[PDB]
Amino acid sequence: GTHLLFAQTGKIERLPLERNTMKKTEAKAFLHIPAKVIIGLAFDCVDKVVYWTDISEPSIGRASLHGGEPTTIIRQDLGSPEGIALDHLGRTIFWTDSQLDRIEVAKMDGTQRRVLFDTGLVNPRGIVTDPVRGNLYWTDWNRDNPKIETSHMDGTNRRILAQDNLGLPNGLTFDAFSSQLCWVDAGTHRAECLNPAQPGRRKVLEGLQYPFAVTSYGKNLYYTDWKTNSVIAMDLAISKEMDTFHPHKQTRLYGITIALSQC
């Protein structure tokens, strides 16, 4: 019922997740978009729709998980969209743009754009939502001042969550049950989790080669790695490497998201 989805140049890959396990042999292409370099990925649990960002055109698009023909929703006034998150309740999308230096929000169909933030952003990339509690989280891999930030989804209460001991925070993910925000850092070579309520205490998993994006499914983390060219599954608590998937076509892996069977 639940699937893993990841990006590569010219395509979006798909593979089943049966009880915290990747069905590697069942990995098949979800969609082929030959001219594009898909970077960010997100999934709308109510309509079962996959969203993505393309730095080639550039553009932001979407397609139903079941069959669906790919459709572009935004093309104009776009720089380098590299992360996209959704509000499945309010029916809106959020994204990072590391060229125009901003975070925008818009309707599912791409209309009624609004620049949520556009100052203090140099290299925003990872971005996630927690629609039920109304919170937005993102990473900015700013070489000089990397940071993990949070704000209300409405645009108020912006603040820095983590600033120290960060190198290249490329992606982050939020798990509603454990109230845990985790990110993968290609500079400090690790994955760190924290409770936004008690930001000071960080759980850390070491040994990550070159993480780009990450998503979560319960106690497990799934990240894409540029060094190993694989999707790596890691368990938070035991801090062990559960499994790895090397797609046959060893090209650069990008965004990653989980297609849930229900919200």
Partner: protein
């Protein structure tokens, strides 16, 4: 008849949609038939619109960030995200309003802001000498940024050069 793919790779062809997919692709290439270059590379591996040009990493004089994506145009090789305030097709020049040697080894002494003083600089120009960084100073004004009056001269804020 044989798979239209490089390096003895196996392939899959769906006759209904007629699309053929190579299982593997050589390093730096991407796409169903390895017909294009992966992000971070540029070229024309199969000569789809010009002579064959094997995919090779972006050539930007080390003035691009390895952690960035879309660093160069995948067909022409044009550098798109030059850092250290550099610019140009190969990140071989400084952006407008900056000076220095973009090809310098140390990023610190590459392209720095001219930071010309608006009172002591001719016509309030923001550009400066490409090597020395010297802004075009008004009469009796000295200093790289034109922010200091020559000894024996005063009132830089006159906007006409220091006077006495």
């Amino acid at each position: 008849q044989p798979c239209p793919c490089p390096g003895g790779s196996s392939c899959a062809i769906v006759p209904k949609t007629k699309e053929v997919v190579c299982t593997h692709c050589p390093t730096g290439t991407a796409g169903k038939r390895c017909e294009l270059c992966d992000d971070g590379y540029f070229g024309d591996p199969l000569g789809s619109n010009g002579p064959v040009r094997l995919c090779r990493p972006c050539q930007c004089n080390d003035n691009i960030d390895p952690n960035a994506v879309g660093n160069c145009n995948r067909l022409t090789g044009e550098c798109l995200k030059c850092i250290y305030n550099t610019a140009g097709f190969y990140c071989d020049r400084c952006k407008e309003g900056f000076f220095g040697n973009p090809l310098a080894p140390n990023p610190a002494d590459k392209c720095k802001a001219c930071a010309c003083n608006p009172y002591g600089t001719v016509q309030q120009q923001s550009s400066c000498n490409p090597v020395t960084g010297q802004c075009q100073c008004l009469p009796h004004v000295s200093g790289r940024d034109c922010g200091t009056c020559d000894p024996g001269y005063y009132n830089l804020q006159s906007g006409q050069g220091c006077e006495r």
